[PDB]
From a paper:
The koLhca3 koLhca4 A. thaliana genotype was complemented with WT or mutant isoforms of Lhca3 and Lhca4, in which the Asn responsible for Chl a603 binding was replaced with a His (a603‐NH mutant) in both antenna subunits (Asn99 in AtLhca4 and Asn103 in AtLhca3). RT absorption spectra confirmed the loss of far‐red spectral forms in the a603‐NH mutant complex, which peaked at 704 nm and extended to 750 nm. Low temperature (77 K) emission spectra revealed a 13‐nm blue shift in the a603‐NH mutant PSI supercomplexes compared with WT, its emission peaking at 721 nm. In the a603‐NH mutant structure, the bulkier His side chain at position 103 (Lhca3) and 99 (Lhca4) caused a c. 0.7 Å displacement of the Chl a603 chlorin ring, clearly visible in the corresponding density maps. Surprisingly, the distance between the chlorin ring centers of Chl a603 and Chl a609 remained essentially unchanged across both WT and mutant proteins (9.3 Å in WT vs 9.1 Å in the a603‐NH for Lhca3, and 9.3 Å vs 9.2 Å for Lhca4), as well as the distance between the centers of the closest pyrroles of the two Chl (ring C), which changed slightly from 4.2 to 4.4 Å in Lhca3 and from 4.3 to 4.6 Å in Lhca4. The EC between Chl a603 and Vio decreased from 534 cm−1 and 524 cm−1 for Lhca3 and Lhca4 in the WT to 375 cm−1 and 384 cm−1 in the a603‐NH mutant, representing a change of 27–29%. By contrast, the introduction of the a603‐NH mutation resulted in quite small changes in the EC values between the Chl a603 and Chl a609 pair (6–8 cm−1). Notably, the a603‐NH mutation decreased the ECs of Lhca3 and Lhca4 to values comparable to those of the ‘non‐red’ subunits. By contrast, virtually no changes in the spectrum were observed for the mutant. This indicates that the major contribution to the WT/a603‐NH absorption shift resides in the different extent of the coupling of CT states to local excitations between Chl a603–a609, supporting a previous proposal (Wientjes et al., 2012; Sláma et al., 2023).
Numbering used by the authors:
A (entry chain B): 662 to 734
B (entry chain I): 5 to 34
C (entry chain N): 111 to 121
D (entry chain H): 56 to 145
E (entry chain A): 9 to 750
F (entry chain J): 1 to 42
G (entry chain C): 2 to 81
H (entry chain D): 64 to 204
The structure:
Amino acid sequence: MFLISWRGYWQELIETLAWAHERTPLANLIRWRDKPVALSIVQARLVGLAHFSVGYIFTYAAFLIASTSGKFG
Amino acid sequence: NNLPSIFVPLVGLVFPAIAMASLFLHIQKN
Amino acid sequence: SGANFARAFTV
Amino acid sequence: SVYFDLEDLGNTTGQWDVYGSDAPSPYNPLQSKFFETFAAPFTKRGLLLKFLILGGGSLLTYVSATSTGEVLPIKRGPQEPPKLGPRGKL
Amino acid sequence: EVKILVDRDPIKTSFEEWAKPGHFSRTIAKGPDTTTWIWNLHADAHDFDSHTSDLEEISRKVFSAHFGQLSIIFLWLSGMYFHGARFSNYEAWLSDPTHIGPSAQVVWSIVGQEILNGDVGGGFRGIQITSGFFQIWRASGITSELQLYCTAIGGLVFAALMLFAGWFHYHKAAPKLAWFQDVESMLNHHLAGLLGLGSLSWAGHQVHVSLPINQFLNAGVDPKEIPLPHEFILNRDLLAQLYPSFAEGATPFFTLNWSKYAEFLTFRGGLDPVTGGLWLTDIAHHHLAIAILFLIAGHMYRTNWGIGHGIKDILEAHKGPFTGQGHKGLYEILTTSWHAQLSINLAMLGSLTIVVAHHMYSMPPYPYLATDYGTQLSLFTHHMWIGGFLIVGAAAHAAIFMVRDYDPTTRYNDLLDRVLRHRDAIISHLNWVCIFLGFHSFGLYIHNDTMSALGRPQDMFSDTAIQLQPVFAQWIQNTHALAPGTTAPGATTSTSLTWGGGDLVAVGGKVALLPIPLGTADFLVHHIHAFTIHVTVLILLKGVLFARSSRLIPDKANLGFRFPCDGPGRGGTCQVSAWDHVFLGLFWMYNAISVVIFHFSWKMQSDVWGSISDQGVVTHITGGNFAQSSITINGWLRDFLWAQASQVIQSYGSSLSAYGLFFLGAHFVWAFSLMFLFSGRGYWQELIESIVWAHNKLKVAPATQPRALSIVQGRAVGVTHYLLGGIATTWAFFLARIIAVG
Amino acid sequence: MRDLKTYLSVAPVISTLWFAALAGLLIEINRLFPDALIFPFF
Amino acid sequence: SHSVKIYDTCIGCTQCVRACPTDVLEMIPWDGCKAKQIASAPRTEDCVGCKRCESACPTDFLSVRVYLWHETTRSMGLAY
Amino acid sequence: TPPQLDPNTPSPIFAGSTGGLLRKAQVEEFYVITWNSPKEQIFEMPTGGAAIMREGPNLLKLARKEQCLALGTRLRSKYKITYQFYRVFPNGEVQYLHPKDGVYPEKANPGREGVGLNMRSIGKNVSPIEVKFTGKQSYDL
Amino acid sequence: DPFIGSLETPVTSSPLIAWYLSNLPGYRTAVNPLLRGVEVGLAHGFFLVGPFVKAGPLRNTAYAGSAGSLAAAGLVVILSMCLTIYGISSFKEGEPSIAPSLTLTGRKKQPDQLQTADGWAKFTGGFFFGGISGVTWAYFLLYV
Ligand code: CLA
Ligand code: CLA
Ligand code: CLA
Ligand code: CLA
Ligand code: CLA
Ligand SMILES: CC1=C(/C=C/C(C)=C/C=C/C(C)=C/C=C/C=C(C)/C=C/C=C(C)/C=C/C2=C(C)CCCC2(C)C)C(C)(C)CCC1
Ligand SMILES: CC1=C(C/C=C(\C)CCC[C@H](C)CCC[C@H](C)CCCC(C)C)C(=O)c2ccccc2C1=O
Ligand SMILES: CC1=C(C/C=C(\C)CCC[C@H](C)CCC[C@H](C)CCCC(C)C)C(=O)c2ccccc2C1=O
Ligand code: SF4
């Protein structure tokens, strides 16, 4: 997700979602304090890298421990 | 003994709820 | 069917 | 066909409450009096927050601790005899 | 009125233009200063709309390109027919089709690749083919090789004729603009002429040639003893013995007592027990009815005479409750821009291809096709991939039209403006429905996995714990099962055996068709299909709608259809062009098609295909574990990807080694694509700088200075490699598994 | 004839002829000498 | 608000002023070149950081530079 | 030049769209663009769709400066029409924004002050180590 | 006003729809927030009781009703905590309300007192009381 898709599409999506939330009844009594914006570029790259590393590490750890513990030899 | 039955819910639910409430209040506070 | 296969191995 | 003026900006930028109603209260006066009398202690904000947090924590901890083994499988404990490991380990 | 208008020798055939490249565009024609020039020369080769502005030149170029494409297609068909004639075992397969594998490619003996000449059967060695051509030829009535040779020669001649026609129409007599814009005559000829006469002639061939030869073949006669097709035409005695009705000649048809032709024009339906295909009489009858219908429907539009209908009158005069004035300026829009026509035609063709795939797997139309599992799998997968690609391309061309061919001053349309004025509501509702559908559909699988891992199999969404049955589909199946008795008095049996109820049909010890049950797994998989389709639609529709202008960029039309970004400001504005939306939607189309083909393959291998014994029991390929193991992601990873990949990887040293080699190569290409997809241009340019310094140190620097690929080119390369790798992996896996076990 | 030669001198056509000739030479060498893992001439 | 700085290498070709989509830059008379004019950036608080001005600037290295800085509602381009 | 006013100008003919003003208009600010058209003609709105501008003076409300400038430059390029836009706050203050000197910025005019001019080449800036531990920046000097 | 970011459609502005939406407890203005909160809480608790008692982990045992009612009470408590946190973080104490002061006709009207610290506090207290009462009433009705 974060490593391929980039910002502009998501910013437009957030634009539309903000309009939708502002125009609906019984839900416009609640208002946001911080204007929602899409993530920056460097932040998105960092998040994608973190996801990549976490998945890599967890998958290999699970495989190694399970495969070595199954036979104990 | 039965310490886990008392301690696990506290760390799992009550303390994160208190932390989230306090942090949100401090973040939004002017 | 043999001749068709042999056509490839003529040389 | 004029849609802008400077004297009053309320209608210029569209500050309307589309579905606001100003009718008097239709609730029964006795019902309102009873509910107002019995809902007084929860009006304050900080006191309500502290009471909610403390009571929720205490109640959840008490229910979790007191609960027997029929409701919770983890409180029943193991029943079948233990089994050995792959290479004869215990 | 309607007339032929041509221009004589608009261009002169000369080799002078070939010498210098990039003559279509001036900036290309100036000369190469950097390597980027080369990459541009191929990017704008077929951008006829940007080379000039006159409609006449664009139309003429389009006509010539169409002729060239037709010539290429004819050459390909001729090559296939010649391969069938020369290097093949068609005659061996004709006598014993069930125990012989089709093969029409023979490998040379150069290096050690001779092991690719596997023993398909019938005293032949060669690569097994899965194109389904042998069934087509058998259903056509071809029983020798001289006929195939003649067909190949005719195809070559037709290709040459098409090439000459293309040259003649571009360089000698070029039709004028008013000729192209005569859509009434075009529609009349395309409906009455191309689709009516063609199907009528094919019905004539089926009635006169295919039916008697196929009857003789099914009767058990040897192929070498069957009379030649023209002997049936010349001799009335043979036809009379085969069909008494022909003894009366054409007299009944002119007398309106058509029941006499009920011998070879029937309405039985169902599947033929001998070959497991549709009755050829039904197919001929359907073709005749289609010919009559198309000939009737091709005379609707007014051309050069008093009678007919006007397209403009029909569009303008249509007043409805929801539309209103509505369709007023659509005629000019659809007769002025090529891109709108391209988009509509692409969408229609993609949908048609998908429907073709569904109907073709449902009811086998060729003899001995159902029992060939590899052919069925290959045909289904190929056609669905083609349909998906075409449907995706339609949106890109719609975006192109909206960007460069839309002006509200000269040509104004009410419905288009009304759609444009409230795009936010459309996008918001589509986003909500996508989120809701995906959340539920994938949360069901995640919940199943979590309850499985915790030792709680009684809290699943399964066939035993909590049931979600597709009641509507079951009701439709029951109604179709009960239809032939009451709803269809003419039809003797059901339209297809897929509907529940009926009897198993098997040919030569192999199951051909049986009713397909529906349970919880089908419910979940269909909802996943809906989710993926909705997300792809959302991406493409957003890209099309927000092409002209957006809240972030109020002047996105000036920048154009293909611009990488607008800048680091506004928080970042990468990938705002419609081209980037198409590039993003390609991945989701790939995801949806992959999931659908996986579902089809597993369901068919589990609950339909298999083997039948003399006693009567049926043993399926995978033991029917789809109904209980496909409700968890672990089940899809273990019982499907892990179990069915044994044949692909253990094919080394055998006649299927090429499949394993391609299996590894596709993985390599898929891993390679991420290099372009993840990185950026500046790093590569800065590295090329040092490399160029190292070159210049030794006086070997080129005049065309090296340059890193542009952003759009990098994204295009990445998506191309990604799609190619994934598709090749699936192709190798499917073909290896189904050839080995099928 | 000048422009025909000029077009046949362009990069893709010259490249494909050169690579086809090289591939033919390699193929013929591999056919004449079936397989070899070392250089046994010397 | 970002920071836009004009250096003295400018030659006064008026391209950066035309390219700006928010009316940030302008030109003033000068005497350091042949064209006798230079650029200036009074309305910096309106800059959105699009860096269109830097794209159209003929010089060995750009004579107008945009450095991104603290963001705000106007510079971020929020319509709500 | 003295800034002008926009008392009672009418508006172009429109049917309505969902790309109009939002809560920010009531809360923070909006912009008002005024021009003069010699004939009633159809143009294309920045928000989306097509509208019709009347003869005489025309006035429009928008949410951002970019939309106003894009519409104005389209008017200048295609219709040859002068335009001017202001910024309006919730308090009623009106600020004149477009040409402040009565002349478009692309043309030089005496009486304009120089802002943000560095009298050196872009490669004469000091290194970040020179400005460390202070608030100023290298390009600011 | 066409240039406002909204559209007039049959569903958005209809006599039946406007009449129905203008009578809901969350849209009255002259009523003090406590009663409206009580009504909203009653409705929400009575609605919420069902799914917990029907699809919980103990739905097949004899402990379904009590466990479901307790879960619904916990959800009500959490929602009350969220409402209190939002009210504390959003509205200030002494500032006047921020509700619109004129209707579609343009006639001036008193601003709603819900968008204030004391008003929101009253609303949250009423919602908590109503939710608890609705939960216990639903439990009493279902299993008696
Ligand atoms: C980190 C620690 C943690 C812990 C200790 C628990 C504990 C529990 N989970 Mg939760 N959960 C967690 C994290 C955790 N969860 C996370 C991260 C997720 C997201 C995946 C979930 C999602 C989840 C689901 C989807 C479900 C649970 C359920 C349960 C309960 C199952 C016991 C039982 O068999 O039901 C016995 C029967 C009961 C209904 C107990 C009723 C009494 C409850 C606990 C309320 C007591 C009221 C109290 C005032 C609450 C307010 C205090 C506030 C501060 C929280 C138990 C209370 C189940 C459940 O309770 O269903 C509603 C269940 O279905 N959990
Ligand atoms: C995505 C959908 C999904 C769904 C439907 C379920 C469903 C279920 N889960 Mg699973 N689960 C999921 C995903 C999902 N899960 C995921 C992602 C995880 C993390 C791994 C889990 C992990 C999990 C655990 C750990 C447990 C369950 C269990 C259960 C049950 C408890 C449900 C519950 O009590 O709350 C229901 C609460 C409600 C308040 C319902 C709200 C929705 C209402 C009906 C909306 C209707 C709206 C209205 C009609 C719209 C129009 C309004 C108009 C009328 C005005 C239930 C059968 C529990 C169990 O064991 O059950 C057997 C359990 O312990 N789940
Ligand atoms: C009844 C006569 C007739 C027929 C049969 C066709 C048929 C066709 N037209 Mg249409 N067309 C017609 C009238 C006709 N047209 C008229 C009057 C106009 C002007 C309004 C057009 C305008 C038109 C355009 C602008 C284009 C086509 C194209 C096509 C081809 C589509 C490809 C295909 O579907 O494969 C079906 C495959 C086959 C039937 C090919 C076999 C060869 C056929 C039988 C040749 C005989 C057809 C020809 C009309 C008669 C010869 C005329 C000449 C000898 C004097 C196909 C050949 C498209 C095309 O492919 O470009 C060339 C295309 O771009 N047509
Ligand atoms: C029905 C036929 C069809 C036709 C006639 C067109 C026509 C047009 N398209 Mg559309 N398009 C279609 C279908 C079609 N499209 C589909 C199905 C898609 C979805 C992918 C698209 C998506 C699309 C995009 C994204 C773009 C166009 C554009 C264009 C125009 C420029 C063409 C170009 O320059 O390429 C010249 C030729 C090439 C660049 C060839 C590229 C090589 C391909 C991608 C490789 C395929 C790999 C191969 C099969 C693998 C073999 C491996 C081996 C070689 C080692 C042209 C008018 C372009 C545009 O700018 O329009 C103005 C553009 O940006 N089209
Ligand atoms: C597994 C896939 C993959 C592969 C193969 C490569 C390959 C490479 N990486 Mg890349 N990279 C990848 C993924 C991959 N990367 C990913 C995921 C990232 C994270 C974004 C990067 C980021 C990255 C960086 C940051 C850098 C590289 C660089 C390099 C090069 C290192 C030098 C070397 O290994 O040369 C070995 C060369 C080869 C294995 C290339 C393949 C040779 C082909 C197969 C030969 C052509 C043969 C055949 C005839 C093809 C015909 C095509 C057909 C159309 C006719 C090499 C091109 C480094 C560099 O550029 O060094 C100079 C470097 O700076 N990579
Ligand atoms: C889908 C597809 C395909 C296929 C296709 C086909 C199969 C087609 C066919 C087609 C056809 C099959 C066509 C046909 C046509 C026909 C025609 C066109 C005809 C004509 C006729 C005429 C012209 C006649 C005339 C006459 C005479 C002679 C006599 C009498 C009188 C008259 C005058 C009538 C393929 C695989 C390639 C691939 C791609 C896609
Ligand atoms: C999805 C996506 C978004 C949209 C993503 C958004 C708006 C983030 C939404 C986050 C929600 C609130 C869920 C957060 C879930 C986490 C568990 C919460 C954070 C936890 C840490 C603080 C510990 C981008 O903005 C973007 C920008 C540039 C390149 C790629 C992308 C991209 O892929
Ligand atoms: C690898 C890579 C490059 C560098 C890629 C380059 C330079 C392409 C090189 C292509 C070939 C291999 C160069 C040589 C081609 C000649 C035709 C060779 C002629 C001689 C014989 C071999 C025929 C980028 O420029 C880039 C830009 C933006 C995003 C990602 C990337 C990216 O990933
Ligand atoms: S970055 Fe964009 S907005 Fe800022 S001065 Fe340059 S052109 Fe103008």
